[PDB]
Amino acid sequence: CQDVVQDVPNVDVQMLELYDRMSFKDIDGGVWKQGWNIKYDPLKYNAHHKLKVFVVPHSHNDPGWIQTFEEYYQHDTKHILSNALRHLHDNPEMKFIWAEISYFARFYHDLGENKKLQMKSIVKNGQLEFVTGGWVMPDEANSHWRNVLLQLTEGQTWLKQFMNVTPTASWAIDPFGHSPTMPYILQKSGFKNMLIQRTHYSVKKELAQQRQLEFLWRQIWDNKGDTALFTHMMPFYSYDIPHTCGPDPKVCCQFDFKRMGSFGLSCPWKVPPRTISDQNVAARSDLLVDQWKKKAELYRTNVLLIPLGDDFRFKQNTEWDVQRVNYERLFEHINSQAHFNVQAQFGTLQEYFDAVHQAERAGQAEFPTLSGDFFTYADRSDNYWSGYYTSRPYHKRMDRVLMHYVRAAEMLSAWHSWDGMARIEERLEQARRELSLFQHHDGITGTAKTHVVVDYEQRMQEALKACQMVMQQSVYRLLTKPSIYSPDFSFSYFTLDDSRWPGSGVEDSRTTIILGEDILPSKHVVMHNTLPHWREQLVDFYVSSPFVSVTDLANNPVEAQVSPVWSWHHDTLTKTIHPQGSTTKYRIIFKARVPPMGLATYVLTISDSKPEHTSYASNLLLRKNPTSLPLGQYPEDVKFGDPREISLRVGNGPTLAFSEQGLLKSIQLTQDSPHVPVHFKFLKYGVRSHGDRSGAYLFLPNGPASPVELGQPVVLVTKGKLESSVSVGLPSVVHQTIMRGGAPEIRNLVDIGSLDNTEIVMRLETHIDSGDIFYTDLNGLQFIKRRRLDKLPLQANYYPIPSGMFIEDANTRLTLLTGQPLGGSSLASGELEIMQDRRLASDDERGLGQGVLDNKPVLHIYRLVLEKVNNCVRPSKLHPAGYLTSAAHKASQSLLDPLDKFIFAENEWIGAQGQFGGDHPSAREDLDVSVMRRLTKSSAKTQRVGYVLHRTNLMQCGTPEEHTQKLDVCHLLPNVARCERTTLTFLQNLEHLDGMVAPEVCPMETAAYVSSHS
Ligand SMILES: O=C(O)[C@@H](O)[C@@H](O)[C@H](O)[C@@H](O)CN1C[C@@H](O)[C@H](O)[C@H]1CO
Ligand SMILES: *[C@@H]1O[C@H](CO)[C@@H](O)[C@H](O)[C@H]1NC(C)=O
């Protein structure tokens, strides 16, 4: 195993280091606005050394953006694919590449048998080539690596099954900036090459000058280079034809033959394309070859990539003809004129890369190594695209909730084979596809039109119902005596109880468990733990009486706490946002202990008075002019007081101090230790008056953020033995700090309401000497070092916070973990800030054609971890990575993969069992079973189950925390006959494993295994 902490990799280009030295000046470079006037030596090419040009036709099909997936399919894409099949079938030298498998699958299944055979032969013969092969071309900023892998797998599994091909070349031309998480997943999925486009214009200029646009991209912590994936970064401002033939768009536009008039389209540089003929072909070729040779100067080999395409192109039959025939004329003339020393032809992406690598092996070139990422993207001037790190935050949070449900449904149902009548495969397929579709760079990114966001949300809501049905049927099967198990596959044995989604305040969707001495006295509840180690976590349920006690299934009492159910309302009468307590239901809380990847059953029983093992929280309402708050049968009266500082401590954990406005002020780790200043504050950013306006994509603040005026907010304090909290109703936000004895949990119920042209940010102010350094994660997979640069505007210093961020000095670290991707930064030493929501009334000119005015209440969740780190073994000052401690990693896990809760729906569960998985191995804390998926249907003689194992890297800080079982996923299910290491998509066997034992992986590595069973 490589050491990912102490050996700083030596690479030719390290993006953080490049960022430190680069100038980022935005000067007019001539026709190539953001470059320079390229020049070439005409004698560089001759008969023995020609320029091989590959023109690769393509069509960017967004799965939802301005139209919904289905509307684009009906009005556009089905015609693109139908005409592609026809044209390629009839024109054998023509080529075309295809990226979005969601669309291709949709298409293919509406095809007649004869067309399917035709389609398969143009794929087999190489004319139609799939690039990447993912269900979509995912966003790279907000997406979790688990879902990037999920959608890549959904598309490639479809391609292998139906087209019998697995792409090894990736094409990502539209994501708004790029992540090293991609080469990481791709390289472990059999890929050999990848292409990217949207990177900072300054970076493009800088790398082009050094001919470093093609590089071996390795992970920032990879000293050896085993993760390296050859990468081609396109050099210009866009992937359209005007910006892909060469440096001058006025010239390249004349070579987009769809712009002569009958298609509506035109050249904004004022010169239109003209049909090629014998009279003008020489003059046209002169212009075109000149462009190619200039573009060729920016790269190292004599092989040139020339994409030919744009959004939803190759739709009309006449369009196929006008592009094909004109380019064929150009090719015939150019290739026959020795003096150009050029051999040009239509080609595919893989043809291009194969030719480049042949040249490389011929010693014609050597490529540089690079590590780092490509965020935050700006396509021009000061237009940094950091607004989409936060846009439509409701759905961003929904993404993470569905990510987890999918994982839990596939894992719970993988333990058995199911009869087709149960429709398990069918429901999981739908859940996987709706979630995969949302990874699209206009889905999770929050950059689609209002009704298209609605379409994605409705699809994820059906996916969530599908997962719940699979999960509850599975739990019923795993915890009912076999000889009693009698399933009705359309019945609800259990209903899921979720405390954080949609969230209290967003939607009253939780069911109350109704008990009564004169009716039903008890109720079974079941917790599932998808993680591969024993886990204890407090779980809460709503009950109809405060007098309830908890037992495990051997009837051992379990300590519990009951609290009122508090909800907040903007009292548009005394003009306050204040809490109300339920007089009809209550919350019971207790610690559930659940086996690794297993289940645990508990029983809640009502009594007529205080039970022996249940305690009650005290409640304090702080506001001047208080009024009473009745709580039905709750046994303790609410206490009142004037606003004041307060301090709390649950168990032996930290003591937190709060301001009189109910916000965190300081944290004291132990009895003795000091009160570390850590203050939460909410501020707002506005939009510029004149000039470029912020929009769904762009964040263009009219200056630093200004404090939200709070007034005298109402603070609610709940103090219990197991859980305490401090909640405050602020304008636009009900902010809550919850304590269970470890790092606190923070929840914000954000409702920007009608605050047009406003972005609400949540900031943490500390005195940690962080300087200009901070850390953010990439796709929930790794943490990268960021350096705030004052030579860049504020918006350029915002980065994706997909799951976490932290700042530290020599002794102290503050890490903020999130349950949803949002934008964020450290704008000053000791500060961390993360955007909560943004309402924008103007369009930001990137084609969306609307602002963001469809905001809705959303419950954001976080864990806040203050830690001493002077004793931790950290990477050197020069290392570009950072790593979490054990506590922060477990805190991220508690947000992304909590215990699932099921309430038995009927009165009596006959044959109920108390636990499942008590014999599963409890693996080391840095190891996770990211995916567990049965890959075969029940009629298959040999069952196959796939596992994706991921090991993160946690800092050594002096806490032994040892003694753990080795997890061998291949022996989790009985009767194993074979165990294989495979690509992460499970599509290719890479190693036959001895003894059918799957070894554990190294820190920061991810592996896949498939176990076969008789
Ligand atoms: O085709 C052009 O005119 C290009 O410059 C592109 O603008 C092209 O429309 C496309 O990339 C626009 N992309 C499409 C969509 O997926 C994005 O949100 C959006 C952001 O601008
Ligand atoms: C699938 O591709 C393989 C090459 O790996 C080929 O040998 C096989 O015949 C193909 N199967 C089908 C259904 O054409």
Ligand SMILES: [Zn+2]
């Ligand atoms: Zn796009």
